[model samples]
Target: GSDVAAGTASGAKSMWTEHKSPDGRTYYYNTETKQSTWEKPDDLKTPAEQLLSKCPWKEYKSDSGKTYYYNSQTKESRWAKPKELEDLEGLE
Candidate 1:
């Protein structure tokens, strides 16, 4: 919220405007973009589902016999598998 420049996000200021709702709540509106919402506009950088791109991994059995999952490509190691992986169709 440091960029209280009177309009919007990283340069989005010129686009949207902040105003009070009829109920006196903070509101935002954009003219050409035809958008309006209570939440601050998306930040300077476009935030995407970047966290979704990290699932595929390999399962490995340790010498002591504990099974762990690893991503050889990303070098990620997880001792507890994700619940989302409960339906996984492959094993290594």
Candidate 2:
């Protein structure tokens, strides 16, 4: 909310919890007051939670001579390498 991610990774790696929309229609993986679903009023409350998209500024190389994105949330990271940068905008 007050800051970007702590450190940017080429993948989903971040210091906050990450979320993916159920329909895959939008990309949200961060936490912000207005951007959060937790703040919804009791009447407007839904089963879903609010989330924001995550951004990464770092890149890593795996032992397989391949590249992957590091998702700090899952912290497990991804092994699939995209051919372009825009592909990192959302989950594959």
Candidate 3:
């Protein structure tokens, strides 16, 4: 029923596989539910799943030679420690 892929990334990443229709459109298929739809389902994501996706907050050096933590999800930088690091098994 569908063809190419847009790649499974973001909150939907491992939760669903993205598929393309023969007409060149896209669909998100829930990996467990057998769902197929042109638009992403709002409730498919859980709170923790989304938090995990943002992470592995990074450490970087600033121009002034200070240590800074970088959060890739947004703002790009934070001067204080992110809470993500507390429970952070976020890294490889």
Q: Give RMSD to native, each candidate.
A: 17.5, 15.1, 13.4
Any runs in candidate 3 off by more than 4 Å, and if so which? 1-14, 44-92
Highest TM-score: which candidate? 3
Stretches of candidate 1 exceeding 4 Å from the true structure: 1-56, 83-87
lDDT of each: 0.41, 0.32, 0.45
Clashing pairs in 3: 3-20
Model 3, 1-92: lDDT tens per residue?
A: 34323455533523456666579976564433334434532234543444544343544342234555544433245566656564655442
**Number of the top candidate by lDDT?**
3
Count clashing residue pairs per candidate.
1, 13, 1
- Can you rank all candidates by TM-score, best first? 3, 1, 2
What value of lDDT does candidate 2 attain over all alpha carbons? 0.32
Better of 2 and 3 by TM-score: 3
Least accurate 10 contiguous residues by lDDT in model 3: 33-42
TM-scores of all models?
Answer: 0.29, 0.21, 0.32
Pitting candidate 1 against candidate 2, the one with the higher lDDT is 1
Ranking by lDDT: 3, 1, 2
